[PDB]
Design a protein around this ligand. Structure first.
Ligand code: 0CU
Ligand code: NA
Length: 247
């Protein structure tokens, strides 16, 4: 990984030491990217709902992961499940349960720093993983992107600024998540969102993560050509809002 400090450095070391899990997936991979494109062609809002019990910014809720997944399955394009242990209180067991219990594609949401974590995603039933440009050297991104592809996944490349986007497009990202979250500070900053979205070619599937909590914000971003919307905290606090987001 890159040289990092603070909580990210902690999670990066945690990830490097993380033992590979015993698991066996129960259906072939369903491309999350391609399901988003099918939602787009059908003119149906594509929401990727996030399951997380906590966040380093202060989320703290308890909700049964299967019930939440079953509830969301009816309306989402897919689910992102936290498996990061210390800051998000997630685990591989949440993914194993959800990915075996719902039919929609699943992104494993964690800090990936090594191939065996992508193995873990695959064996646990996830359909794809995110790789984070701020965390990974360009060489590690290239390598892990190639490795995910070799398993049948198209990973989401997570970018926050123009420097990250430069990298993601150079390595040939086909699926990008544009986050307003500064992973260091934890603050949501939207200053550069409009510019970043507009720099991504039309045939790259783009997803926005930004503390979204209102249908209006989705409508605004969709006008810019955004394909899908990752929504975590507002749905963890009130899952019933999925209806405002997809109606
Ligand atoms: Cl896997 C992953 C990692 C990060 Cl930092 C993300 N930020 N927004 N969506 C994400 C998915
Ligand atoms: Na560095």
């Amino acid at each position: 990984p890159r040289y990092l400090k603070g909580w990210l450095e902690d999670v990066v070391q945690r990830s490097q030491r993380r033992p590979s899990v015993r698991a066996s997936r129960q259906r072939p991979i369903i491309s999350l990217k391609e399901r988003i494109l099918e939602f787009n062609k059908r003119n149906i809002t594509a929401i990727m709902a996030v399951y997380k019990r906590k966040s380093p910014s202060g989320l703290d809720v308890e909700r049964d992961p299967i019930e939440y997944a079953k509830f969301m399955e009816r309306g989402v394009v897919g689910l992102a499940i936290l498996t990061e242990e210390k800051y998000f209180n997630g685990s591989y067991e949440d993914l194993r349960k959800i990915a075996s219990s719902v039919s929609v594609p699943i992104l494993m949401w964690d800090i990936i720093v090594k191939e065996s974590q992508i193995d873990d995603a695959y064996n646990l039933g996830a359909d794809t993983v995110g790789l984070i440009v701020k965390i990974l050297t360009e060489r590690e991104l290239e390598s892990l992107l190639e490795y995910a592809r070799s398993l049948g996944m198209e990973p989401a490349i997570v970018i926050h600024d123009e420097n990250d986007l430069d990298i993601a497009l150079r390595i040939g990202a086909r699926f990008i998540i544009i986050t307003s979250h500064d992973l260091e500070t934890l603050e949501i900053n939207n200053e550069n969102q409009r510019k970043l979205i507009s720099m991504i070619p039309s045939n790259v599937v783009k997803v926005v993560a930004s503390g979204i909590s209102e249908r209006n914000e989705i409508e605004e971003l969709y006008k810019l050509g955004v394909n899908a919307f990752e929504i975590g905290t507002s749905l963890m606090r009130n899952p019933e809002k999925i209806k405002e987001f997809i109606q």
